[PDB]
Design brief:
The structure is cut from a larger assembly and holds three copies of chain A. In chain A, 0% of the residues lie in helices and 17% in strands. Chain A has no helices and two strands. In chain A, strands 1-2 form a two-stranded antiparallel sheet. Chain A is flat, with a radius of gyration of 15 Å. The termini of chain A are far apart. The interface between B and C is medium-sized, with 27 and 35 residues. The structure holds 2-acetamido-2-deoxy-beta-D-glucopyranose (2 copies). Chain B: This is Complement C4d-A. The PDB classes it as immune system. The entry lists the keywords Complement classical pathway, convertase-substrate complex, C3 substrate.
C-alpha cells in the first residue's frame, strides 16, 4: 500500500555522512514552497 | 592513543565390473553334493559383490528377492548331505574331504547374515576341522576332490601348504559367527590352531621356493589372521619380490586367482600400486563369459568388492584453530573449528 | 494376462508421505487380492524402514491410492544415510496373490526410486533492502511444511559475509513458525552482498536464502528514470530506426523536479567495456520534470565512423546512455544509467517451449507459440505464419501454410493437420512482418507397428483459473477397441493427487476441478491397455496465478496524501486467525540501491511450491514408459519398468 506524505511548505536538510572536526563545511537547507501564494520567510540556525 | 582498535580472524579452508556380467552368475543350484557348491559359490560371490558395491539399483527389485530365495534353497540343499560330525562329504556313503568342509564352512559363514541357521551345527564342523590337524598345524586330505579343474591354483609344485592356508582362511571366516558366550575351550583351541598354522606358513614362506598361487594365498592368510611381525614381513617381502609388470602377470584361472589373492592381501596391508592390479582384474573380467573356474570368480569378486569399498570411502577433513592472548580484559582463549560442516571448505570469521 | 500396476513419484523426500497408486488390470470378477506395500533398502538388507500400508483390490474396485509415510527415524535406522555412492531406495509391493495366480518367480514387484532430503518451505525477510555499514539488520524467517501450513520444526539460520565467510549461526525451536533476530554489520565492512540462509536441522539440503546489499550511501531526495522510445534498435542493413529517449526526474513525494540534465552516450559490449563518443552529449533543462532527447542518424553515423567502425559490427553491442541531472537551485545531483538498449535484427521473438514434441499420428498437432516483443510485454495482433512440411510417408513431402494473428498475451494455437504413416514433421514459424522473427522445430514420428496411440485434446487453450473445471477429450487413434475404461491421474507438485477410471465412449470427456491444491501447474496422465501393452499420453496445464488459499487485504481508506505526524487507520482482514507480519518501508531506498532487489511476492511463493515437482517438458512420449518418465512417475507391472532417475534435474 503506497502511502505518501506531504507538507506543501517545508525545509530539506541533507548533511554529509561525517565531517572531520575543525574542518569548515557548508549547510544548504532548501525551502520548498508549493503553495499558490508568493511568500517571504526568515531562516536561522539555533546556536549550540 | 585515543583510537579505536578492531581485530578480525578469518580461516579460509581450500579443498567397476559391469552389473550384467556379475548378475548372470545367479543360477539355481542343482546336482550332487559337489554340483551344488559349483553352482552356489559364484552365485553367492555375485550376490555379495552386488550387495557391497550397491549395484542393485540397476536391477529390478524382484531380482534381489529371487537371489535371496535361491541362496536360501542352496543353503538348505547341503543340509541333507551332512554327516554325523558335520563332515559334509560329496556323498553320504563316501568319505569326507578337508577342502570340502572348509568350503562349506566358509560359504555358510558368509551366508549367515541373510538367514539365521543354528551356529551350534557350525560348531561341529569347526570341531571336525580341528580334529584333523597335525603336530605342526597342517592338514591332510583323505580323498582328492572329484573335479580338479574347479580347484583353481591349488594344484602345482606344492599343494599341502595352499590347502592348509585355505583351511585357515575358512576357519577365520567362521570365527566371526562364533557365539560371544559358550564353548570357550573350543574358541581357545581354534586360536591356538590358527596361531600354529600362521607360524608354519611364515616358516614355509621364509624357506621360499613356493608356487605363485601358493605364496599369494599364504601371504593373504598371514595378513588376515594377524600374523606376527617377522613372519608377516618376510611373507610380504617374498610376495612383492615376484611381482611382474598396468599389465600384471584369456588369462589362465591361476593368474586371476593369484592376482585377486595378492590384491586382497595388499589391501589388508594402497598408493599407486593397487590401481594397476585392479584395472587388470577388471579388464580380465570384462571378457564375455569370463571368470571360468568357481574359485577365481569368488576370489576376484571378493577382492574387487573390497577394493571398491576401500577406494570410494571418504575422509572427514576436519580442522581446528584456537587463539589465546592476554590483555587488560583479564585472560580469554577462543576456539573456532571449521569442517565439512555440510559445505566443502567452510570459512569462518 | 492379469497384471498389477504400481505408480509412485520418481523422487522420495524423506519425512514426507509418499503417494503410491496401485491398480489391478485384467482380473476375473471372482478374484479379490490383498497385500502390503513398503519401502526397502536393497543394500543393507530387506529391512523395511517404512510402515507397511495394506491394500485390497477387486474387480469393482481395481485401483486404490495409498499414502505411505517415510519417517526420519526408520529411514536413519536402515542405513539409508550410510550408503557410499547413490542415494537410491527401493519401493516394494508384496502380496501372496502374485505367486498363487501368476506363478511368478518371486512375489516382490517394485521400482528403484531416488530419495532426497528437501522438505518444507522457508521464507526470509529483512528490514530494508540496502544497509549502511555499521547499521543494525533485523530479519525474520517463516517456516512451512510441504502442505503449505505453518510448521513447528527446528531450523538453523546462518549469516554470511561478502567474501563468503560465515559471521553468525543460531538454532531455534519455533512454537509459532516465526523467528526474529537482529545483528549488527561491522563498521569497517567493505561493500558487497551478504546472504542469510535457513535450513531444517534434520534436512541437510532444505536450505533457503535471502540477500541484502551493504553499501555506504545517503538516502536520496529524488529518482531519475531513463525510458527508451522502444526497447530495441533495428540494425538491419535495410534501415536503422530512430533513437529517442525520455528522462524523467521526480521527487519521492510526487512533485516534479526542476533542473538541468547532462547526458552522455557510448557503446557497451557484453564483456563490460564502455566506449563513449567524445561528443554527442546533451545538456537540456527539464520541463514538467521530463526532457525528450534523441540521437539523429547522421550524427550517430558520424560518431561511428570517427570510432573506426561500421554499422555492421553492431551485433551484440548495446547503446549505453548515462545521465547526471542537477537540481536547481537546490544543487543536489543524481545519476541514472541504461544498460538494456540492445541492437537487434528483429523486433519480435518466438517461444516454442509450449509446443509438444513427438506427437501421435492421425490426430491434429497443435503448435503453440508466444510472440513477445524484444525485451517487453507479450504482443497481440501480430500475424504468425507457419509452414509445416509433412515429410515422406512413402510419397513426396507435402507443405501447408497457416496464418493466425496473436490474440492476447501473444498466445497462438495453430492446428496443423498430420496424416497417418507420417515420418517426420518440419516446422518453420515466422512472426510479424517486415523483419520477421523466425524459429524452426523438427518432430520425429513414433516407430511403426505400435499397439496404438492416445490423443488428448484440450478444447480451450487458455490457462484455467482456480475453481474452474477443466475438460479434456480423450480418444484412441489407430488401435483396436478391445478395452472398456480409460485410466487417468493427476500429478501436482511432484505427488500423485487424483486417480480415477472413465468408461470408454466415442470422444470420452474427463472433467477435472481445478482446486487450491493443484496450483501453479499439474500433469494429466491417461492411459489404457491394448491387450498386454500400455498406451499412454500426458499433458501439462499451467494454472493461472491469482489469489491465495486465504486472503489478506491491507487497506487504508482515503486519499494517498498525508501530513507528518498524522494518524492512519490500517485495516487488516483474513478468513481465520493469522499472524500478520507487517512492515513499512521507505521508497527512496530503491533509488539509493544500485541494482533492483525485488521483494517476496506471490511469484516467489509459487516458484517455491512447484520447485518440488519432478515433471519435465510439455508432455508426450514415444512409448508409455517414456511418457511416465517425463511426467515423473515410477511404473512397474511385471514386464516393464522405468529406470531410476540419474539426477534430480531433468536434462
Ligand atoms: C511572486 O514573485 C513573482 C516573481 O518571482 C512576482 O511576479 C509575483 O507578482 C509575486 N506574487 C505572486 C506570484 O502572487
Ligand atoms: C542450498 O544450498 C546449496 C548448497 O548446499 C546451494 O547450491 C543452493 O542454491 C541452495 N538453495 C537455495 C539457496 O535455494
Amino acid at each position: 500500500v503506497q502511502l505518501r506524505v506531504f507538507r506543501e511548505f517545508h525545509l530539506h536538510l541533507r548533511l554529509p555522512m561525517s565531517v572531520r572536526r575543525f574542518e569548515q563545511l557548508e549547510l544548504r537547507p532548501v525551502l520548498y514552497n508549493y503553495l499558490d501564494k508568493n511568500l517571504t520567510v526568515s531562516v536561522h540556525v539555533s546556536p549550540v | 592513543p585515543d583510537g579505536d582498535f578492531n581485530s578480525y580472524v578469518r580461516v579460509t579452508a581450500s579443498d567397476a565390473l559391469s552389473p550384467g556380467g556379475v548378475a548372470s552368475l545367479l543360477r539355481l543350484p542343482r546336482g550332487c553334493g559337489e554340483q551344488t557348491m559349483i553352482y552356489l559359490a559364484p552365485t553367492l560371490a555375485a550376490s555379495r559383490y552386488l550387495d557391497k558395491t550397491e549395484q542393485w539399483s540397476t536391477l529390478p527389485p524382484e531380482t534381489k528377492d529371487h537371489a535371496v530365495d535361491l541362496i536360501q534353497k542352496g543353503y538348505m540343499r547341503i543340509q541333507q548331505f551332512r554327516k554325523a560330525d558335520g563332515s559334509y562329504a560329496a556323498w553320504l556313503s563316501r568319505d569326507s574331504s578337508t577342502w570340502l568342509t572348509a568350503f562349506v564352512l566358509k560359504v555358510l559363514s558368509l551366508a549367515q547374515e541373510q538367514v539365521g541357521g543354528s551356529p551350534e551345527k557350525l560348531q561341529e564342523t569347526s570341531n571336525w576341522l580341528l580334529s584333523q590337524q597335525q603336530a605342526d598345524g597342517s592338514f591332510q586330505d583323505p580323498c582328492p576332490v572329484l573335479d580338479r579343474s574347479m580347484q583353481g591354483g591349488l594344484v602345482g609344485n606344492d599343494e599341502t601348504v595352499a590347502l592348509t592356508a585355505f583351511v585357515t582362511i575358512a576357519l577365520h571366516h567362521g570365527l566371526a559367527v562364533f557365539q560371544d558366550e559358550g564353548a570357550e575351550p573350543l574358541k581357545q583351541r581354534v586360536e591356538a590352531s590358527i596361531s600354529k598354522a600362521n607360524s608354519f606358513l611364515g616358516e614355509k614362506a621364509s624357506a621360499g621356493l613356493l608356487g605363485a598361487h601358493a605364496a599369494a594365498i599364504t601371504a593373504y592368510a598371514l595378513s588376515l589372521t594377524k600374523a606376527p611381525v617377522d613372519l608377516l614381513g618376510v611373507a610380504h617381502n617374498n610376495l612383492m619380490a615376484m611381482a611382474q609388470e598396468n599389465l600384471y602377470w584369456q588369462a589362465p584361472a591361476l593368474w586371476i586367482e593369484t592376482t585377486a589373492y595378492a590384491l586382497l592381501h595388499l589391501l589388508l596391508h594402497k598408493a599407486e600400486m593397487a590401481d594397476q592390479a585392479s584395472a587388470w582384474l577388471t579388464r580380465q573380467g570384462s571378457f564375455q563369459g569370463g571368470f571360468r573356474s568357481t574359485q577365481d570368480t569368488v576370489i576376484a569378486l571378493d577382492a574387487l568388492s573390497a577394493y571398491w569399498i576401500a577406494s570410494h570411502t571418504t575422509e572427514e577433513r576436519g580442522l581446528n584453530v584456537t587463539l589465546s592472548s592476554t590483555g587488560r580484559n583479564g585472560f580469554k582463549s577462543h576456539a573456532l573449528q571449521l569442517n565439512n560442516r555440510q559445505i566443502r571448505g567452510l570459512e569462518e570469521e | 494376462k492379469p497384471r498389477l500396476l504400481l505408480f509412485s513419484p520418481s523422487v522420495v523426500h524423506l519425512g514426507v508421505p509418499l503417494s503410491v497408486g496401485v491398480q489391478l488390470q485384467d482380473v476375473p470378477r471372482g478374484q479379490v487380492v490383498k497385500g502390503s506395500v513398503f519401502l526397502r533398502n536393497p543394500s543393507r538388507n530387506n529391512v523395511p524402514c517404512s510402515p507397511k500400508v495394506d491394500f485390497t483390490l477387486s474387480s469393482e474396485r481395481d485401483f486404490a491410492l495409498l499414502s505411505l509415510q517415510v519417517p526420519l527415524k526408520d529411514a536413519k535406522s536402515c542405513g539409508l544415510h550410510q550408503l557410499l555412492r547413490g542415494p537410491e531406495v527401493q519401493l516394494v509391493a508384496h502380496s501372496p496373490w502374485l505367486k498363487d495366480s501368476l506363478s511368478r518367480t518371486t512375489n516382490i514387484q517394485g521400482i528403484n526410486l531416488l530419495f532426497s532430503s528437501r522438505r518444507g518451505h522457508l521464507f526470509l525477510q529483512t528490514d530494508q533492502p540496502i544497509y549502511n555499514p555499521g547499521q543494525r539488520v533485523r530479519y525474520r524467517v517463516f517456516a512451512l511444511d510441504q502442505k503449505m501450513r505453518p510448521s513447528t520444526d527446528t531450523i538453523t539460520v546462518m549469516v554470511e559475509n561478502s567474501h563468503g565467510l560465515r559471521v553468525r549461526k543460531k538454532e531455534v525451536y519455533m512454537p509459532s513458525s516465526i523467528f526474529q533476530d537482529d545483528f549488527v554489520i561491522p563498521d569497517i565492512s567493505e561493500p558487497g552482498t551478504w546472504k542469510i540462509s535457513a535450513r531444517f536441522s534434520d534436512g541437510l539440503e532444505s536450505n533457503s536464502s535471502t540477500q541484502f546489499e551493504v553499501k555506504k550511501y545517503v538516502l536520496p531526495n529524488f529518482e531519475v528514470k531513463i525510458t527508451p522510445g522502444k526497447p530495441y534498435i533495428l540494425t538491419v542493413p535495410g534501415h536503422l530506426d530512430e533513437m529517442q529517449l525520455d528522462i524523467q526526474a521526480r521527487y519521492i513525494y510526487g512533485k516534479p523536479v526542476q533542473g538541468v540534465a547532462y547526458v552522455r552516450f557510448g557503446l557497451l559490449d557484453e564483456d563490460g567495456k564502455k566506449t563513449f563518443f567524445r561528443g554527442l552529449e546533451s545538456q537540456t533543462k527539464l520541463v514538467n520534470g521530463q526532457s525528450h532527447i534523441s540521437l539523429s542518424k547522421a550524427e550517430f553515423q558520424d560518431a561511428l565512423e570517427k570510432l573506426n567502425m561500421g554499422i555492421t559490427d553492431l551485433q551484440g553491442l548495446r547503446l549505453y546512455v548515462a545521465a547526471a541531472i542537477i537540481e536547481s537551485p537546490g544543487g543536489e545531483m543524481e545519476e541514472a544509467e541504461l544498460t538494456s538498449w540492445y541492437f537487434v535484427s528483429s523486433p519480435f521473438s518466438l517461444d516454442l517451449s509450449k509446443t509438444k514434441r513427438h506427437l501421435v499420428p492421425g490426430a491434429p498437432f497443435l503448435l503453440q507459440a508466444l510472440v513477445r516483443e524484444m525485451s517487453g510485454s507479450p504482443a497481440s495482433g501480430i500475424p504468425v505464419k507457419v509452414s509445416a512440411t509433412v515429410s515422406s510417408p512413402g510419397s513426396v513431402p507435402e507443405v501447408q501454410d497457416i496464418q493466425q494473428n496473436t490474440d492476447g498475451s501473444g498466445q497462438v494455437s495453430i492446428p496443423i493437420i498430420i496424416p497417418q504413416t507420417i515420418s517426420e514433421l518440419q516446422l518453420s514459424v515466422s512472426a510479424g512482418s517486415p523483419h520477421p522473427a523466425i524459429a524452426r522445430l523438427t518432430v520425429a514420428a513414433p516407430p511403426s507397428g505400435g499397439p496404438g496411440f492416445l490423443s488428448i485434446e484440450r478444447p480451450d487453450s487458455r490457462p484455467p483459473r482456480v475453481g474452474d473445471t477443466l475438460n479434456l477429450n480423450l480418444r484412441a487413434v489407430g488401435s483396436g477397441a478391445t478395452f472398456s475404461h480409460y485410466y487417468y491421474m493427476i500429478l501436482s507438485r511432484g505427488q500423485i493427487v487424483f486417480m480415477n477410471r472413465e468408461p470408454k465412449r466415442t470422444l470420452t470427456s474427463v472433467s477435472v476441478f481445478v482446486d487450491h491444491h493443484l496450483a501453479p501447474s499439474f500433469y494429466f496422465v491417461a492411459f489404457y491397455y491394448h491387450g498386454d501393452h500400455p498406451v499412454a499420453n500426458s499433458l501439462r496445464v499451467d494454472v493461472q496465478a491469482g489469489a491465495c488459499e486465504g486472503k489478506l487485504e491491507l487497506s487504508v481508506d482515503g486519499a494517498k496524501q498525508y501530513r507528518n505526524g498524522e494518524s492512519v487507520k490500517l485495516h487488516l482482514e483474513t478468513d481465520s486467525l493469522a499472524l500478520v507480519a507487517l512492515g513499512a518501508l521507505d521508497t527512496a531506498l530503491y533509488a539509493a540501491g544500485s541494482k533492483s532487489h525485488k521483494p517476496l511476492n506471490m511469484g516467489k511463493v509459487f516458484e517455491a511450491m512447484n520447485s518440488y515437482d519432478l515433471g519435465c517438458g510439455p508432455g508426450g512420449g514415444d512409448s508409455a514408459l517414456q511418457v511416465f518418465q517425463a511426467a515423473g512417475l515410477a511404473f512397474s507391472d511385471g514386464d516393464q519398468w522405468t529406470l531410476s532417475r540419474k539426477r534430480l534435474s531433468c536434462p
